[PDB]
Symmetry: C2
Amino acid sequence: LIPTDRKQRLTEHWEFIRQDMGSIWEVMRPITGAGKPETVPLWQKVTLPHCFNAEDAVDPDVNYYQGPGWYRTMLNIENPYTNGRTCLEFEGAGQKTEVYVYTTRIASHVGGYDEWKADITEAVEAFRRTPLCRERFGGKIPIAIRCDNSRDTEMIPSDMSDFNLYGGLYRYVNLVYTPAVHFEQIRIEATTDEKGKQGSISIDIAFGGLKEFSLRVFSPEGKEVNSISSELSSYQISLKRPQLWSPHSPALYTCVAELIDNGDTLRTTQHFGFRHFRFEEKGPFYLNGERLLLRGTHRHEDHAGVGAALTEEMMRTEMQQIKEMGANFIRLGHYQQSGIILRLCDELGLLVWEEIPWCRGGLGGESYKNQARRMLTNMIEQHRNHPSVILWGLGNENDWPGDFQTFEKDSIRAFMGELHDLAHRLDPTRSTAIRRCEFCKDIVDVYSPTIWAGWYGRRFRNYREMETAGINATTRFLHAEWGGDSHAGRHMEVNKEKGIDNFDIEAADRNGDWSESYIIRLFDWHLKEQETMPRLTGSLFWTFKDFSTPLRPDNPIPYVNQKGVVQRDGTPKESYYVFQSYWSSKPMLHIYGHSWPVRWGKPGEPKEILVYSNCPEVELFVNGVSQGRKKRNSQDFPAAGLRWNVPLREGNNKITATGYDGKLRLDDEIQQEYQTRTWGKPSRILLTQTAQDAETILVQAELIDENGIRCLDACQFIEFGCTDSEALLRNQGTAQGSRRIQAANGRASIRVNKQHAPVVVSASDSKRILKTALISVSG
Amino acid sequence: LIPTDRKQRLTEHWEFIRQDMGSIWEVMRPITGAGKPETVPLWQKVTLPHCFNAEDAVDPDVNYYQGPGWYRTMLNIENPYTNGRTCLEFEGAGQKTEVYVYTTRIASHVGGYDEWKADITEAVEAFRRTPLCRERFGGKIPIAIRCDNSRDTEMIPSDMSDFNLYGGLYRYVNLVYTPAVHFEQIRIEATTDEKGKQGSISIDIAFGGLKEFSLRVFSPEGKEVNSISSELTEISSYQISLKRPQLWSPHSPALYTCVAELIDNGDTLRTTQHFGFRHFRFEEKGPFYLNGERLLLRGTHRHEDHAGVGAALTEEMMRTEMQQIKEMGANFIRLGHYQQSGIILRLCDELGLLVWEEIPWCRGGLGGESYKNQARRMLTNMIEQHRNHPSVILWGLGNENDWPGDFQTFEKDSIRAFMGELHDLAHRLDPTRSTAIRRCEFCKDIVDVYSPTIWAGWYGRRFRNYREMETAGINATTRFLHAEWGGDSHAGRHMEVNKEKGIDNFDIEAADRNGDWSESYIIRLFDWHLKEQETMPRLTGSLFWTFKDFSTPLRPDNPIPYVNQKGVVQRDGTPKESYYVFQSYWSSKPMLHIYGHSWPVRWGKPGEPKEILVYSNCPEVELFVNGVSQGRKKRNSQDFPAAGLRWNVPLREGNNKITATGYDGKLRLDDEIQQEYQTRTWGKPSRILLTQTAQDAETILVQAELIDENGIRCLDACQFIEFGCTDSEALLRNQGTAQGSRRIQAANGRASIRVNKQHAPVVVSASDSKRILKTALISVS
Ligand SMILES: [K+]
Ligand SMILES: [K+]
Ligand SMILES: [K+]
Ligand SMILES: [K+]
Ligand code: NA
Ligand code: NA
Ligand code: NA
Ligand code: NA
Ligand code: NA
């Protein structure tokens, strides 16, 4: 990662093909004529970032592609510094990568997630001394990059992992010029006492190549705190009463380094923050001396339609959405993530646990270990400036065997100790962590076991017991990963009849209906319990967003881990507002059931209604009749005391809530049908055009019994087809962008691109027991 | 390839996945529980032979897959011999292959077209001496095979070739047991003079391992002609005498048999070998003589390619196809650009087809040492593995080696040098046969027999220029043989003759770029060539390219995408009407074919007399139109076209019945077609109409029709048309055929696709690929 503020993202005018080529010459050779043998195979025009698996990760019928691919482009290289260096900078590419200038290989890399670079200065110059350069390419420089994500047992992470080992140039590639002498590494170590009285900055600058260079520090308010003019170094300064960075107040200082030479100015701007943190033995966690409850989530480098190839603008939206939920903490999946995410965590205010991808499978040979050592090193060195980061993780579920014939707790223990020592040698400032490896729990500073209350183990009401069992089983405890799957749009009516009700069950993984109705209770319970555990460090629920995993072909959305509170395209589930009503300080108000169109029960039966709100008082209205203004109280489960039991008319009902917080008044409204007719087994599929959009039409399939009652119970897979194989929005991994998807209360919908109309859309049950239904979509 | 009559084809219970795996352990590791991480990726249950590109070779929207894939299965290994040896035998696998017993690699191979084996004897043993054999697999043996057809410019053939470099175990794999001492090689050289007075049989036998052994030679009738017993020595040689032997020829493929037999521990190792007595000669500046008589070689080619299977042809499929060729009247075949399945060689021996077989040094230039060693190795394997076949008279050393591009250099002198090394290697290995190459003028003097490139009427000049170009080619080389000629035709596309810059609209230059790819054109081109060959006494012969439409990666935009359409039959073996042009000239079996069985709508002015051609080898043929006899006519090859069997006839608007009767002595032969005659002319295409014309118990045929704005069929429309379906598996697609293609150019305003009956009801859509017409739909009951 070159330190400079001037960089060009290479996003346009790339070609890509998803296979290996016969040689670099085959990649580079000229085309002698149309239809000649070298004009196949065909390449694709693509824009970067690009991912091999943008679609096939969630395609229900194929294994996501794991193999080589090539990219190529023509670059206009104009290094404006005399004797300047020219680099291609990779913010991230998976999994193995080779870089060529014309026919000469420049650099190679193993590792999907660290940053690295390729100095092309010499190859470029050499290419310019040949006639081919201007006679054939007209000045430009031919560049080719091979990316490979073939299965490799000796490379981390393990394919046993519960996520995709994406291939491609899925993080930005930058063209970077520097002058002859330039910055190579700017390390900023800010320290402060737990009370914030004394601050100490400490800047180490490593130059490349080998007149004065300046160094300025700025306060969060832009005030030049101090300047240094020096000469070609390390450096340390005291500060009294430094403004402290916290999730609540993510205040950031700035360090500016300038090299001036030949009248041009190499500048690099960087941010850092002062904060103190402590993981109390057998106790909670303190940030700048005050106990803080870590309210944590996870994210993967994954998104609908793009696989790993997210843009900056997408990352901003998502991180902003996570901040508005009220999180103050996040574990960045199982690998180093985009520098854009880290900078967002510094800017918005989220503490960070970032780990290397030693994730399941056991332990490999020497290059395996060297990748781990290298990636830990790269992660620490590339990210250490970020105030947000407080944990360096060393591995995840390393107790999970299977990638080798042997599994050796002693060898794993030894290597884990080596990594712990390397992290502390490299960055004393922070603590180490692993998750779920009982026989290494002592090696690290902060341990997380596996605790999935009500999902994989026990009932969610056993959380507090299991949590304290964990706090007592380890020196320093953090709870990484809890929650459970919900099929967005599936709901379930409470049935107060061998358990407190139908939601009070053990291990909903294999006993639950994967409805939002259940998980909303489970999240709710956990967050209530957390209000009365003053010695808990905190926890991180897995996970923020539905994401693709190769391990779940048969999930309600195939190949999608559905443990988000938000769909894979960012569309919030109703559980999102559960977290938001407990954790956010911005007043909000959400009636549960915006995505619940039809409720059921016997005629005149009073129906439960839950509101999730951080307002202290909310009044609810049913069909215009106030049902009473109630007061928020987290202990009155569920919904923190904001629940009613109201009668519903057969057919439509209008449900309304008004929220009060001081002078502020909030409002929300849903409409729901109430169905008193009971239903038999599904008998027909009804296709409806629900209409939707200036560019999209929403098609709904409906499972009904022989007398025409919707089967609000039905979970059958439904499959969509179409006379135009590009009209359906498919392979998104979402509720309305999947071609095969389990019904949600006997219902399944899919979007149709309007510009492709007119077409015919078909809907079938996957088991092919019902008759296929057809609908004409005109536009 | 081990000589024993006792071997087992492993066709059942294989698993396959089209990607590399993370290690051989990952292939072999056990399943710990349903849904556990090692449950993915998912594998396919397949039956061998199997090909990576069974469908995607001709899928119009993808590059055919070029990469690794894995097979795995469980074998009961019951070797019935004391210290016997167990081998997996590969009759062919592409392109690179690696063989594993459990986690141990056995053998590896580079080359997709020669035979090779892997001796698994010691690994099976060392594996049985482990507890996992009994505990986990219950005494059976786990086998895995990695095949790879990644692009590799240092591997022959070149990806510039006009065929797919297919991947997978597309030829049979055999489990084979032999004794500790066994036959390794059995070479049989039958020699006879050009009039068949005497015969000599030299027999060389090599043994692996290291008492006596037996050797019997049986006539083509089963009668023992000669017998020997001899002491077992590592290499042996025997020469047997024989008076006026039965001669092998295409017309009369008399085959002798040699049976070798070895006994130990009571068990009898036997191997049976066929061979043939024949004498042949390529005359300098002259023709070709078989058993003392000049014989005009009537040749074709075939690729190891077929609809729905890529290279994974079964033995039954090969029987059907070779018979179809023999019945066409060919006597000669060049087996594509590579060694082909031994089943094809046996069929050539048995039906009577002379053979040119070459190594896949095919385009691109010349690579490094590994590349050169592969060519030396495959030439060696091809000759050693097929030399006992009497059908084989020509070893080819390469094809279009003047085509550069796979490397930055192209060194004619280095190519000459390596070509000359290969010629010497072949003549050293097998002095009894001639070397050939095709299209490399700067090497043409090196080999025994040479073919230039000559495509009169297709890639150059007019088809009427054929004799002149053929004579030029015969004058320009010591021994000449015309390999490759003909041209593409879109099955079911035709064109009315028009006499208004040439003789008629079919008298054109270089139809590849200038023609309409109709059957009408190519039929005349084949007709002309064939009638010219009757007046060329110096011509050894030719091989037209090619028998059957086959997939090629080089033609994304062909009327059938990715299909080379120069066959006289479709990729599924459905005959085009050009198949009968050849048959009428070459077959001795009486036949009669009115041209136009696949031509449903003729056109022209009202009452205008319309031409009808008939392709028959019957001496006399009478045509009837609508019951009215049009005259008995005598067959005369030189009376072009249709050898004089042609009539001009009135057709009425509407349906017309056209019948023909041919007379061969007392054989009355009959044929009949019906055709509509359309006198209305047409504007540009404007609507697509769908209809169904299903006549099978399994399939419905759906037809798209391009019509003008007044409802008139556009009878010269060639637009690409695309099919879709509410059920993505109902359409019979990716076949490379006229009715099994998702996208295909219209054939006189018409395109059709088969629909699977079981999947009905569905809705089929048809569009012009350019999207200027509105999409059509039809519901299929
Ligand atoms: K998938
Ligand atoms: K791996
Ligand atoms: K293809
Ligand atoms: K090749
Ligand atoms: Na490795
Ligand atoms: Na392994
Ligand atoms: Na995601
Ligand atoms: Na090359
Ligand atoms: Na074929």
